[PDB]
Amino acid sequence: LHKDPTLDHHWHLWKKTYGKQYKEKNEEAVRRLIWEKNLKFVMLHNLEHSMGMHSYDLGMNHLGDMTSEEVMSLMSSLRVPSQWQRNITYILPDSVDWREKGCVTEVKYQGSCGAAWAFSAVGALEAQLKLKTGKLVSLSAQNLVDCSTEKYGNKGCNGGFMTTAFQYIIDNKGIDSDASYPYKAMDQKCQYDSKYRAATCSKYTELPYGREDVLKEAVANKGPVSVGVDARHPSFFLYRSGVYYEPSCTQNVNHGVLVVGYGDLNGKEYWLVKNSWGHNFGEEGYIRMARNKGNHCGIASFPSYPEI
């Protein structure tokens, strides 16, 4: 509709803070309107939060101006298979955080490429590498995007799945380090170079659907687990801090993330989820999602973890 001139200065401040630059004609105006709608959503939700109506609050992060198109791509990262098509095989502490054991690399920024599946996969493998060599090394998601393609049912920036990615690493007998094969957020020619192989994968394990109890076990005894969640919600996109719980969440997952732990805040149990939307998303790039709440957002619907 029409912008609110009283917000002009703040809109300017917001753009500068996140380095927003709109070079296409009329893009500016469209972005401004999306931003205002999200601001009102954020404002109302935090108001409710101030009245103790939610265990989490929202913020105008860099996604505050995301378009319908960009949301689409974002929600197209996961090409999840059918449940019955998963080779399901496979006392615990009340809390776990693999970051404390130095098994989680710094958060990545997928940008405008739907490669969440790849980041989820390497993330899970990065932990196993550290537990095998003692050295934490970021693995190449780009390598998965460019190489683990059609043969594995993956479509680079147009989506894919973690298990087929692990299968590629196994078949390929290795994956490059992110440093030698950096992420470009684009579908490019496969450039795998065995000379810079930083890790290998021998197998992966898929966990039984909707079993948050089993997911808890794997996270505590095996390590970070690759999972898909339903993130098709403004609440998720603008999540700032706290325990995320969205009554409108479903089990139809669309975004690949990594469970690196679990715990509870003031009684509210949660999954410590590493995202791939940079450090300015949520809690330093992480989101704590509701645990033991009927498989909230389908977090336990497609769990899997690799092994060196």
Swiss-Prot record:
The active site is at A116, H255, N275. Thiol protease. Key protease responsible for the removal of the invariant chain from MHC class II molecules and MHC class II antigen presentation. The bond-specificity of this proteinase is in part similar to the specificities of cathepsin L. Monomer. Belongs to the peptidase C1 family. InterPro entries: Papain-like_cys_pep_sf (IPR038765), Pept_asp_AS (IPR025661), Pept_cys_AS (IPR000169), Pept_his_AS (IPR025660), Peptidase_C1A (IPR013128), Peptidase_C1A_C (IPR000668), Peptidase_C1A_papain-like (IPR039417), Prot_inhib_I29 (IPR013201). Pfam families: Inhibitor_I29, Peptidase_C1. It is found in: Lysosome; Secreted; Cytoplasmic vesicle, Phagosome. SUPFAM superfamilies: Cysteine proteinases. It comes from Homo sapiens (Human). CDD domains: Peptidase_C1A. GO terms for molecular function: collagen binding; cysteine-type endopeptidase activity; cysteine-type peptidase activity; fibronectin binding; laminin binding; proteoglycan binding; serine-type endopeptidase activity. Its EC number is 3.4.22.27. The gene is CTSS. One of its GO terms (biological process) is toll-like receptor signaling pathway. Disulfide bonds join C103-C201, C113-C157, C147-C190, C249-C297. One of its GO terms (cellular component) is late endosome. It catalyses: Similar to cathepsin L, but with much less activity on Z-Phe-Arg-|-NHMec, and more activity on the Z-Val-Val-Arg-|-Xaa compound. This is Cathepsin S. Residues 1-91 form a propeptide. Glycans are attached at N87. Keywords: Cytoplasmic vesicle, Disulfide bond, Glycoprotein, Hydrolase, Lysosome, Protease, Secreted, Signal, Thiol protease, Zymogen.
